[PDB]
Amino acid sequence: QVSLAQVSDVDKAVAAAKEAFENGLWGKINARDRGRLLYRLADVMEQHQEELATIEALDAGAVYTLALKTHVGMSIQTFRYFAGWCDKIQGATIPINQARPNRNLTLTKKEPVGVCGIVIPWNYPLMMLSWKTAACLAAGNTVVIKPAQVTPLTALKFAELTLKAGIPKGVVNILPGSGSLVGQRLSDHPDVRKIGFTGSTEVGKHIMKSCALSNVKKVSLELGGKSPLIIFADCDLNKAVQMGMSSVFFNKGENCIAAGRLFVEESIHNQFVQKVVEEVEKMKIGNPLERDTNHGPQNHE
Amino acid sequence: NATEFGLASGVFTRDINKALYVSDKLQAGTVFINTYNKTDVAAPFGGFKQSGFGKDLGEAALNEYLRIKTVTFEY
Amino acid sequence: SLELTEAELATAEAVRSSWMRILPNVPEVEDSTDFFKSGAASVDVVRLVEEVKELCDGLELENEDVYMATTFRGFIQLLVRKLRGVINYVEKAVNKLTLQMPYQLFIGGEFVDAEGSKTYNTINPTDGSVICQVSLAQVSDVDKAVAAAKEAFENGLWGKINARDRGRLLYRLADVMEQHQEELATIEALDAGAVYTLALKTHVGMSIQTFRYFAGWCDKIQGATIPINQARPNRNLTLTKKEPVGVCGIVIPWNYPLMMLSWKTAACLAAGNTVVIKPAQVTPLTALKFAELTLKAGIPKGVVNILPGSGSLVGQRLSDHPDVRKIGFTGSTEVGKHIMKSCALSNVKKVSLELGGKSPLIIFADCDLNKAVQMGMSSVFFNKGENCIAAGRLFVEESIHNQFVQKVVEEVEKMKIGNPLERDTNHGPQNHEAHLRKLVEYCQRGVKEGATLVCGGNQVPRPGFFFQPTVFTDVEDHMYIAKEESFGPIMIISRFADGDVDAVLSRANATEFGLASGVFTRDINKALYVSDKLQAGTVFINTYNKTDVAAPFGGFKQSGFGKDLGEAALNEYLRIKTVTFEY
Amino acid sequence: SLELTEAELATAEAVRSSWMRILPNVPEVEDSTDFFKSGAASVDVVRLVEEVKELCDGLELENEDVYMATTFRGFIQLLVRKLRGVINYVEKAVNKLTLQMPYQLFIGGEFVDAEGSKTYNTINPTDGSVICQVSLAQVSDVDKAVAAAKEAFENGLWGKINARDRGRLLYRLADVMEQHQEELATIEALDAGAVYTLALKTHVGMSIQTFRYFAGWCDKIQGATIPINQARPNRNLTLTKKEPVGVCGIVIPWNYPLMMLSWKTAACLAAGNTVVIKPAQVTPLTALKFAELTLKAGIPKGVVNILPGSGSLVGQRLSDHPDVRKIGFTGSTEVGKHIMKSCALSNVKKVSLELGGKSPLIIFADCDLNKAVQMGMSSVFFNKGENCIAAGRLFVEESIHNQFVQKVVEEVEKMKIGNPLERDTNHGPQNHEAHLRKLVEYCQRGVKEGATLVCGGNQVPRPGFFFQPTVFTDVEDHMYIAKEESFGPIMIISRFADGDVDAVLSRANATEFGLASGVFTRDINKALYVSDKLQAGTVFINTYNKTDVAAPFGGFKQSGFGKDLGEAALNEYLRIKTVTFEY
């Protein structure tokens, strides 16, 4: 059983985040110091990589061999990458028109916005969290994450490791629950200045609408698509069949950049399909913890 | 290209003239050539028309979370 | 189509002989034979033009027309046409000049009337009388504009030509505007009511600087090549390309007709987009004059489109239209919120907002007073009050409070009020009648609460829409005038105690807005400290109203997001493709 | 090579079964069959490692080992070896620790003696006595180092691995240095004579920060995609790639043994180069300890090479050698000119110089005095005088001249002199004996011309190479001490009149050098004006000795060219290829 968040709990999270930003230690310390903490977080995740990968297999139903490479692997690479940026975010000094004979000097400074409210999808629990959270913390912000209801366990395990890594209290906040209750409140709340989102179009349109009405807050959307894949005759077939299957059947179908349509040329159409069917028969189906398994079970009912 | 979406796309060919030509004309965020599912944390990622706006991953990912102050002196 | 004479065939055969020599193999030059498909270099195009000019005396041929007519029949037909083969103005005589103002719509490089020949009057605020009638746009006209813009982008010449070629056209546009700088400045003085000396420097001057700046960027928009993880032992190569979005729908305010048009349009065209501008109803004439100059500059037809009319009719339709991919806006918060809501519902289109703000201006004792008084007035009373980065509140220190206000009143008396065309004039008339009415209610409501009116705060006994420069003192934070924006020539002064930096910052930052701010001090420690703590987009130190086309400009919390001017401006109008190889 | 048992064949057949399942088609797995040439993804490498670990209990297998052994026989042979199948230190007990210092050369990840077992003694300046003998490099040894470096670059593992992988190794190196930070700091105190409290902050501290900084850059070095002129109607695509140059030959000074090594080496390795370091003869021990930690960090053998010896023998050969493509140098102008000369004659190799300078420090009356005295001393007497950006001259204003000097003398008396390991010590002993001798001649020649000696200017009656903090006053521009660099704890004070900014700038700028400069003032107008006019690389305002690894650092006229630290540092060690397509 997992705890269901309420409106009262959201208020405490945003309040804790604002205190951590303004009066807290996160804001006071140097950019190089923030980068060290984010790099230390990645080393802690590396130690518990087998543990996190097993939780993904139970929660999301992801294959274990894939989970180490993709789900847990990229998450570690993400926090290591954006840790480096922390003390490499430079402004500029602009050569503007001098009010002759007097002199002038103009310069720019890049600063954090404040509190952020991330909402992640269910296809990649840990990876989508990492992509947004790492970049947000690197800039020097406090975060209020909202994981998917079907897959909350990866996010709660990540929260445990922030204490070990030694992140100041209030920076990272996590609230497992329903999207319509929690997600809608973050949009309406005036303290929140930024809403990250990755999901569907209909749901995505509602957030941008709520963002405008609330306090003209910033927003970035990442919606689904119908990606084509053209295959000409001149290309080698054996590789085209491998990468053809690997576009569609990667991570048991559930992939935001999955091949929606395959356009194949007439000369190699019949030959292509014949090779695909042969390889699909060889694909193994079973328990994701077993190493022999290739294809795993779907995320939820 | 006849689609409201445009997140990713792909093409398989040996001929270089096709690869470079098709990559330009394909209205999509991420184009792959003789590969597929090859993202990197350094390389940016995002949609075009009705696949949202902004970017995740890379240097462009920081810009959305930052804001620019502009100080001006006179002496 | 055209039939050849006896002498024209002798020319045609001489051209046929040249094609054989220029091209490498070429077994036979028939009518169907294409020039470039045979295998013609960019050097061969120059050799062709020169060789043809040797035959025919004169014949003003260029490299562009060769790219148009690729085939042999198409080339000969075009060449034969060269050998063998009106805008309705409103005249007005003012300022030792004869003005010529277009008064119609502008769709596809052609001045045309609206559906049903509907019109509306535009006012001259100096005298009060009408100058001319202007065409009122409709929903049917908007469809034609967006259709023309889409054709110009996709199938038109704008997309095909090089980045360096686009930059040359945008630079040529600026040179044309420079020639007609006195003409444009006079139209501003009649339409908007801006002072002539100011209009040359600010209104018309920056417009020219804008198009010159963003012309340079056209062929300096570079992507990247990313060092990604190689799938050992195989190799990989990733690169990014910055591209145009497509069609854009700009909506500009009335405070700066020509300048706000330039800021958005120049950056949009530099990226390589087609535009559908919507000017303010009160001030359309500057935009229609700009459309005339694009024909002279030699911009392809369909690129620039202008539709004078009401905001609720035209502006709302652009948001709803699915072909439009980007909405630029500069105005009020309430109106701005409506566009972002419509943007989401339509087709999740991109948007950048530029809303008004209540900018503070702190003045310490250590600063020199004479300069502080000059720049203090120049913050408030610049461009007859109407300025988006105007000083909303002035926090003055107790030691120099009484001394400061005394000097301000002396200088306000010296300020001249009259016709904006006259050089002696300093302060000019307000933009339109509806604006003047609110400024009277603003000052009336100020006295009610209990703000000590020093001078002004009422309409001038004069024909027109003039208003007296006003000064308020003893203003608290809880008052209405402290919170709400005037958007007119009204100075609001406040007190703060000696040697208290943290307290005054708390009062200054206590606002939902945050567009601009200022501070005057000699001490370096205060200047750098205060600049950090001030929650605002643009901070000024010992200066005010000092923007540049190179320096970026935009708000923070409830003053929109995104940036106008500088390199950051281009990022809004561009989109990043990411190509990835494997070998 | 190794024969199989009965049980090992059962394991081999289980592995053979896995290869059939993992790979797509694979008609038959034989000894010749390669894993990747068949068509194996990066996911398949993980599936292999896991499947093999299910069979054999334990077996610490990693993905790196799979990339080494691609073939089936190579994989099985390697796998069988896993199942079935000293550094000479100099001990010394000081500072509640037991030190372990390598004393040999370092060529190809191995500590080895020189040709003929030639050695030289290294001195402890605190006591005066010898600590150990160190190996003296020869011409034959240089050839082995450059040969090892070239193999590591071309055929070695360093070149093959990803940019992100290189960054991880450089970050792991910093963590190893952090663990041995107290050990490295103690060696500095014995070798260089640096104070222990300072050594942790400056010498060892910045070294750790350097490698952490440039580790981040490894996978953030991006090229570009240029919008060039399309040969209409054909298309074109241009892009740039930043690549390593090859082998590099660094030569470091004696003032900061470990820090100057880090500044150049970290940036060089980050770009993706192999290095041949040449440390100073007086201080080799810090570099040899650093070489030990590269083995622990897990750097491939051949990447880092270190050759302690004479500069004229080793340093000259690196310049002459054609395999070397880049020479980093930090020292004097006399020696610096000789390297650039040799670089041209050899094989037109690249070079970046970092020479000494005579940095001014202007002090106005309006600035607060107590802070000016602190930072005034901290400019001159930082790191026992020996600092490349030390304050050469101090221009003080007449009003606060007498008051300033009085406060300096009081504080100089309070300064502690003793053993650098003791925490109470402030000022430490000079680096070596030959340096101390010149500082005596410097102060003797100063008094001759007629400079008022306030205090100091002579050797301390003590065992070691200590020197008294010195202060000179009433110094003219024509004098020797005004022009020539001391490179020791000697404050040179001068006078300038009240309210004369332009005159004092003329005196300050009147010098062939220009590395650093400083100014103390409260008034913002002076600070910004003086900073512009001062012809120097690094200007400080109300501070001094405040470098950062992010901020760039380099000279102007006769203080070399190029930059150390920051993003600009990488550009020297990289080269730009430009690929161009047509389609």
Ligand SMILES: *SCCNC(=O)CCNC(=O)[C@H](O)C(C)(C)COP(*)(=O)O
């Ligand atoms: S919603 C976006 C989902 N993300 C992805 O599809 C990216 C996952 N891909 C990878 O982690 C690598 O590209 C894999 C498939 C493991 C191949 O890496 P290999 O060639 O080193």
Ligand SMILES: *SCCNC(=O)CCNC(=O)[C@H](O)C(C)(C)COP(*)(=O)O
């Ligand atoms: S909505 C933003 C309105 N724009 C401005 O306030 C910028 C106008 N200012 C200028 O063009 C110059 O800074 C002025 C004050 C006209 C002249 O400055 P001078 O020092 O060259």
Ligand SMILES: *SCCNC(=O)CCNC(=O)[C@H](O)C(C)(C)COP(*)(=O)O
């Ligand atoms: S040859 C170049 C000489 N380098 C230096 O003088 C730089 C050494 N300075 C520092 O490490 C810091 O700037 C110190 C002096 C420790 C002050 O740091 P603090 O203000 O954090």
